[PDB]
């Protein structure tokens, strides 16, 4: 025999990780282990693998740099400490015993260990053009991948309008607070995953790009635009 | 407040540079700065923040490695050192202030800071593929992205011809000088960003595939290359 | 002249090696020398180049990690060290002799070295999904890139397969050898570079992701898998 | 010539600065240009040059991952660039004129850039060892090599003890406050570099390490410390 | 409260360790937490901090390759993350509690956690230099820091010859084994971390340098080395 | 068994060399294979090793970064590539073959392959101090570890003055060649590795420190000075 693997993690980009797996019912150090990477309904890899009895090791080139294999005889433990995670690493890995002669490459496995690196949240804007007539309602869109609310109970969800040549300019600030000096014709509304600017009557002075923002989950991101122009 | 940004930078890939923000108004220490980019149409990124009164930073993940945030309480100023730059960095950067309290993300911005980062001469070649009958007359062209003109005035675009299996042997230098011992059917014209190679009269010997070359500004680059074969 | 460079190098990924360029029929110091890269029918490109006399250098910056040129003035040679080689550096790679002048570039080249760093074995597995009716015959084929015999004269292909929420289980190893306890419904042929597996009866619980691998050339790869699923 | 350089700079480890040489008198690209380093009564070591012609450049080994060299023609202006640095960093940086035919290494100098890291704190603690009778009164001395003044007001300095087998705890902050549980036998004094604490009457529970530190600047740090012990 | 912090580590140099802090007693979110370090009978450093509440985080510039700081707010726990340890890591890892307002550095500390980095064997070859006169008995002393016994039953030291000009020679292996063509007149004894080469009548060929070496634990090492030479 | 080991190399800092080792008088791929490094008179030291059949590597961990292992199968050889190469790379490199069965470890040498990485030139410069009174006559001193003549045929030694709070000045060039404005009491002569300043009547505006300097070898190297002041 049996290969037991510790248990699934959950960690953010950049951060490192060192699973293990135990053997019993055999002699540890009479047998190679390998370590094999599943990716979410994509296929299967080979990482590498060490000889428990004397600690030499075969590297897959592709994942040198990605991890390192080790072995603690007196547990009779395998370990692989992986580093600089990305989105690319999320997948379920597995140990697997190779033959004691060297015909068969993984006659018993672990039952795996799943490492999950979270995904950076996506902000959808629509329209990405939006011509309009002086004096017009208008109304834009912006919806998330994942939750916008934060643990301490706040949505920093802001909308931002810029001009052209010149910077942004805060229009709205936790979903519906209007920044000191904006005019009462912008409103924002919402929750969770879904977010609207409404402007009640547009002026010129209001074409440009607006763009909404999440700063409730590193990293803090930006949504696509929207270009409000005169229509003609 | 105010927020005054360092000028414009025109810089080669690999090249560094330090861009400073100076704040005025306001207790400099009381407020969080963060730094946003922005690349040409494409839209707005966050970089990261620092806290000016204890000096603590927080990091995008994917710009760790590329920025380093600072301050210096003095002159009020707040900094951001951005190295190994690449096309893909040249943008707009802007610095702006976070909220005295935790609601609003951007409340005052700087005027923002272009960074751009030189692009390589591209040389366009055509056509691709150029069938000809022994005797007839035959003209290739060589297109630039910039001027192919260095500051001491002269035009450094050469041709070369590479016969199968052999390495490339040079015929024309410097626009429309012929090589040492190349025959006078081969002739080079043109200035600028467009040029013309010709041969009076093809031979069999004349077979093969044509690079045009730039020697005028670092990194040096070839056309992609045209083949003169016998017709059929 | 006449500049005469090293033999042909066969690598692996991951490999250095470190070409020459010995110069004669003129005096080494008094010219500069430059490399260039020629990918297998893609085009040219300027590595970089070296003053023989002072030992100056000036790189392409896309090249400049990956190369160091230096040279060797008693015996009249220029070298090249190419560094943490991978697939997209197999090329044939070119000294070339600037003008004394400043004129013309390259007039007169190397032979040319070839640099071939070769490729992992790729198994194409067929098809992609299989319905099936239990007591059905059933058949699933696997060819790779190249040879999957090693020096010793054994073929290390095997085949395994994974049920749902488990990990893989051996079936065949060896090419044709069915693992202890695996049902004779299942067989294993084939040899060099294409095989298959059998199943003379499909019973419900064959039903999962068959995956073909190949333990004899690093990296060791697996097949893209096959979904055996009850017809419907 | 005449070649003026930027004015001093003042740094803190792990930032990098981008010095400048203005040339006048001469043709600019007609020139090498050589960079010298001076630390603090300690020599002149050559590090690198630059051929603003071609763009050719030559290091001096020891210092190729540290410096960069590149030149602006239109402004007549060489650039040196420092990356990562140190205390071992801290120098007077010169740039110099190589002669028109090499004859000569450093023919005119620029008046010289004055580049200082600044330095970590040193507390230094007296005595090492103090035995003392029980009941006796004791006195430990802490002095700095810079002031322990914020900018804010206040003077972060501490007091901490180490019992036999346990871990520190916090006796005086802020110079002279007693933290929690603390006894009134304990007292602390002193302002800017020179720091005292006090024991009243020595009992055997106030035996151990103790040890001063400073949370003024960064990085904070701890004196050598003084173990109490008795003289039985 | 109360900090409690995970147990001891024994790892060799190369590998990596997470460490954890629970905190209990408190509000996670609203205190800031620091980290320390020990080295046996050394003295006190600082690492560097975070704040559980928005993430940001401050190092001391010399542990910033080596250190990284993260929380998991659900279960009130801080970590960090120790990579390619050295020798020069082994020490007692301490967290601790920052003041609310920020009045004092460590109110509040961790139990601490041991991490020792395994030291590589010694062996001290004695003498150094060893005249003799032709027919004289020789002995030779080498003595080793940790125990040369392998957890498989055998011992592993040896014993090389180094004549004049040549490279080294087998002598012994396995303590008292002799190799082939060694003369009857060297033998080996001892066990354990004390071993002892005799030489019974010396001879001319005998002289050069003697080696004493332990393949048992990696990094497999050497002694010093005694010089035999004759009392002409 | 015989193991044949390839030719000495003399490197610059910086270099990278790759060396192998042919076996021949028993199955290569039946034994592993050590590497093993000597310094000048300094002692032995274990690299790695590798097992020629199945690929796999042990490194001591000190030369991890330093040095990579590989074989070629059909020519029976084995390889050990060196990078980055400093003056503590410089020693005697061996191959050697591990017993059948492991009982011992060096049982068979090759002859060694020399690796001399290249010495900076050093000048010691004497006196470091030198009182005299005005009018008198001074005498300087400079020798260099290696000799200072240049291929081309030219000695570049020179002779450079710093007055207090000035930058350094020249003052002789190409051993004996005074530059402008330097007063007819200067003198220097030499070859070779010895060299002098000589001033016939000392005034107080000579007084400072001089500095002898050698640009014929890189890294170019200054002397360590010699201060010039009065017997008041």
């Known amino acids: 025999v049996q290969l037991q693997q510790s248990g699934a993690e959950l960690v953010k980009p950049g951060a490192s990780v060192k699973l293990s797996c135990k053997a019993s019912g055999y002699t540890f150090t009479s047998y190679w282990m390998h370590w094999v990477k599943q990716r979410p309904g994509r296929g299967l890899e080979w990482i590498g693998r060490?000889?428990?009895?004397?600690?030499?090791?075969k590297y897959n080139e592709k994942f040198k740099s990605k991890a390192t294999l080790t072995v603690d005889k007196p547990s009779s433990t395998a370990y692989m400490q992986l580093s600089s995670l990305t989105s690319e690493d999320s997948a379920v890995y597995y140990c697997?015993?190779?033959?004691?002669?060297?015909?068969?490459?993984?006659?018993?496995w672990g039952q795996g260990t799943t490492v999950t690196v979270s995904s950076d949240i996506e902000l959808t804007q629509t329209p990405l053009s939006l011509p309009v007539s002086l004096g017009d309602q208008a109304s834009i869109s912006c919806?998330?991948?994942?939750?916008?609310?934060?643990?301490?109970?706040?949505?920093?969800?802001?909308?931002y309008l810029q001009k052209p040549g010149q910077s942004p300019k805060l229009?709205?600030?936790?979903?519906?607070?209007?920044?000191s000096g904006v005019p009462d014709r912008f409103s924002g509304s919402g929750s969770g995953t879904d977010f609207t600017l409404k402007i009640s009557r547009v002026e010129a002075e209001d074409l440009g790009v607006y763009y909404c923002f999440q700063g409730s989950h590193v990293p803090y991101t930006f949504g696509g635009g929207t270009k409000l122009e005169i229509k003609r | 407040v105010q927020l005054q940004q360092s000028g414009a930078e025109l810089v080669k890939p690999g090249a560094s540079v330090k861009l400073s923000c100076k704040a005025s108004g306001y207790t400099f220490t009381s407020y969080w700065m963060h730094w946003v980019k922005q690349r040409p149409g494409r839209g707005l990124e966050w970089?990261?923040?620092?806290?000016?009164?204890?000096?603590?930073?927080?990091?995008?993940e994917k710009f760790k490695s590329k920025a380093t945030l600072t301050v210096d309480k003095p002159s009020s100023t707040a900094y951001m050192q951005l190295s190994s730059l690449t096309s893909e960095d040249s943008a707009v950067?802007?610095?702006?202030?976070?909220?005295?309290?935790?609601?609003?993300?951007?409340?005052?911005?700087?005027?923002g800071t272009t960074v751009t980062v030189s692009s390589d001469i591209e040389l366009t070649q055509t056509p691709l593929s150029l069938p000809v009958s022994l005797g007839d007359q035959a003209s290739i062209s060589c297109?630039?992205?910039?001027?192919?003109?260095?500051?001491?005035?002269?035009?450094?675009?050469?041709?070369y011809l590479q016969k199968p299996g052999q390495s490339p042997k040079l015929?024309?230098?410097?626009?429309?000088?012929?090589?040492s011992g190349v025959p006078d059917r081969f002739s080079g014209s043109g200035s600028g960003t467009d040029f013309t190679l010709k041969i009076s009269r093809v031979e069999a010997e004349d077979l093969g595939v044509y690079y045009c070359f730039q020697g005028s500004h670092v990194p040096y680059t070839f056309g992609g290359g045209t083949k003169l074969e016998i017709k059929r | 002249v006449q500049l005469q460079q090293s033999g042909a190098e066969l690598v692996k990924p991951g490999a250095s090696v470190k070409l020459s360029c010995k110069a004669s029929g003129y005096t080494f110091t008094s010219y500069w020398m430059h490399w260039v890269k020629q990918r297998p029918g893609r085009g040219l490109e300027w590595?970089?180049?070296?003053?023989?006399?002072?030992?100056?250098?000036?790189?392409?910056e896309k090249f400049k990690s990956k190369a160091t040129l230096t040279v060797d003035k008693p015996s009249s040679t220029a070298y090249m060290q190419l560094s943490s080689l991978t697939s997209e550096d197999s090329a044939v790679?070119?000294?070339?002799?600037?003008?004394?002048?400043?004129?013309?570039?390259?007039?007169?080249?190397?032979?040319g070295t070839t640099v071939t760093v070769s490729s992992d074995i790729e198994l194409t597995q067929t098809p992609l999904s299989l319905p099936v009716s239990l007591g059905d015959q059933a058949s699933i084929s696997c060819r790779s890139s190249?040879?999957?015999?090693?020096?010793?004269?054994?073929?290390?292909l095997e085949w395994y397969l994974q049920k749902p929420g488990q990990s893989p289980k051996l079936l065949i190893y060896?090419?044709?050898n069915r693992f202890s306890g695996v049902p004779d419904r299942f067989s294993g042929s084939g040899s060099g570079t294409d095989f298959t597996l059998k199943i003379s009866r499909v019973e419900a619980e064959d039903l999962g992701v068959y995956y073909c691998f190949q333990g004899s050339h690093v990296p060791y790869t697996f097949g893209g898998g096959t979904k055996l699923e009850i017809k419907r | 010539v005449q070649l003026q350089q930027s004015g001093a700079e003042l740094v803190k480890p792990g930032a990098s600065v981008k010095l400048s040489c203005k040339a006048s008198g001469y043709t600019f690209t007609s020139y090498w240009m050589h960079w010298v380093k001076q630390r603090p009564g300690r020599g002149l070591e050559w590090?690198?040059?630059?051929?603003?012609?071609?763009?050719?450049?030559?290091?001096?080994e020891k210092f190729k991952s540290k410096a960069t060299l590149t030149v602006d023609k239109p402004s007549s202006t060489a650039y040196m660039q420092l990356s990562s640095l140190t205390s071992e960093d801290s120098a007077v940086?010169?740039?110099?004129?190589?002669?028109?035919?090499?004859?000569?290494?450093?023919?005119?100098?620029?008046?010289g850039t004055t580049v200082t890291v600044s330095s970590d704190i040193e507390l230094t603690q007296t005595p090492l060892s103090l035995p003392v009778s029980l009941g006796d009164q004791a006195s430990i001395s802490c002095?700095?090599?810079?002031?322990?003044?914020?900018?804010?007001?206040?003077?972060?300095?501490?007091?901490y003890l180490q019992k036999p087998g346990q871990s520190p705890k916090l006796?005086?902050?802020?110079?002279?406050?007693?933290?929690s549980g603390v006894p009134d036998r304990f007292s602390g004094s002193g302002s800017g570099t020179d720091f005292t604490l006090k024991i009243s009457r020595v009992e055997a529970e106030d035996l151990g390490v103790y040890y001063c530190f400073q949370g003024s600047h960064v990085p904070y740090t701890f004196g050598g410390g003084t173990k109490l012990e008795i003289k039985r | 409260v109360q900090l409690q912090q995970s147990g001891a580590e024994l790892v060799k140099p190369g590998a990596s360790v997470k460490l954890s802090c629970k905190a209990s007693g408190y509000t996670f979110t609203s205190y800031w937490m620091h980290w320390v370090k020990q080295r046996p009978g050394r003295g006190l450093e600082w690492?560097?901090?975070?704040?559980?509440?928005?993430?940001?985080?401050?190092?001391?510039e010399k542990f910033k390759s080596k250190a990284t700081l993260t929380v998991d707010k659900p279960s009130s726990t801080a970590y960090m993350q120790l990579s390619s340890l050295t020798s020069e890591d082994s020490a007692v890892?301490?967290?601790?509690?920052?003041?609310?307002?920020?009045?004092?550095?460590?109110?509040?500390?961790?139990?601490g956690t041991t991490v020792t980095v395994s030291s590589d064997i010694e062996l001290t070859q004695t003498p150094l230099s060893l005249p003799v006169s032709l027919g004289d008995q020789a002995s030779i002393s080498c003595?080793?820091?940790?125990?040369?016994?392998?957890?498989?039953?055998?011992?592993?030291?040896?014993?090389y010859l180094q004549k004049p000009g040549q490279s080294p020679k087998l002598?012994?292996?396995?303590?008292?084994?002799?190799?082939s063509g060694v003369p009857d007149r060297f033998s080996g004894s001892g066990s354990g971390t004390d071993f002892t080469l005799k030489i019974s009548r010396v001879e001319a060929e005998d002289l050069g340098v003697y080696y004493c070496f332990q393949g048992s634990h990696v990094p497999y090492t050497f002694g010093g080395g005694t010089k035999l030479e004759i009392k002409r | 068994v015989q193991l044949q080991q390839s030719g000495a190399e003399l490197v610059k800092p910086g270099a990278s060399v790759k060396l192998s080792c042919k076996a021949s008088g028993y199955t290569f791929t039946s034994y592993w294979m050590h590497w093993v490094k000597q310094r000048p008179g300094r002692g032995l030291e274990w690299?790695?090793?590798?097992?020629?059949?199945?690929?796999?590597?042990?490194?001591?961990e000190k030369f991890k970064s330093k040095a990579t292992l590989t074989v070629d199968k059909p020519s029976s050889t084995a390889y050990m590539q060196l990078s980055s190469l400093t003056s503590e790379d410089s020693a005697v490199?061996?191959?050697?073959?591990?017993?059948?069965?492991?009982?011992?470890?060096?049982?068979?040498?090759?002859?060694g392959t020399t690796v001399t990485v290249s010495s900076d030139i050093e000048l010691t410069q004497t006196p470091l101090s030198l009182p005299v009174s005005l009018g008198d006559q001074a005498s300087i001193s400079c020798?260099?570890?290696?000799?200072?003549?240049?291929?081309?045929?030219?000695?570049?030694?020179?002779?450079y003055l710093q007055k207090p709070g000035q930058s350094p000045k020249l003052?002789?060039?190409?051993?004996?060649?005074?530059?402008s404005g330097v007063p007819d009491r200067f003198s220097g002569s030499g070859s070779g590795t010895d060299f002098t300043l000589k001033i016939s009547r000392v005034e107080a505006e000579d007084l400072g420190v001089y500095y002898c300097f050698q640009g014929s070898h890189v890294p170019y190297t200054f002397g360590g000075g010699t201060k010039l002041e009065i017997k008041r």
């Open positions: 060896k090419v044709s």
């Open positions: 190249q040879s999957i015999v090693h020096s010793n004269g054994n073929t290390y």
């Open positions: 060490i000889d428990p009895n004397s600690g030499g090791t």
């Open positions: 697997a015993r190779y033959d004691y002669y060297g015909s068969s490459y993984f006659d018993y």
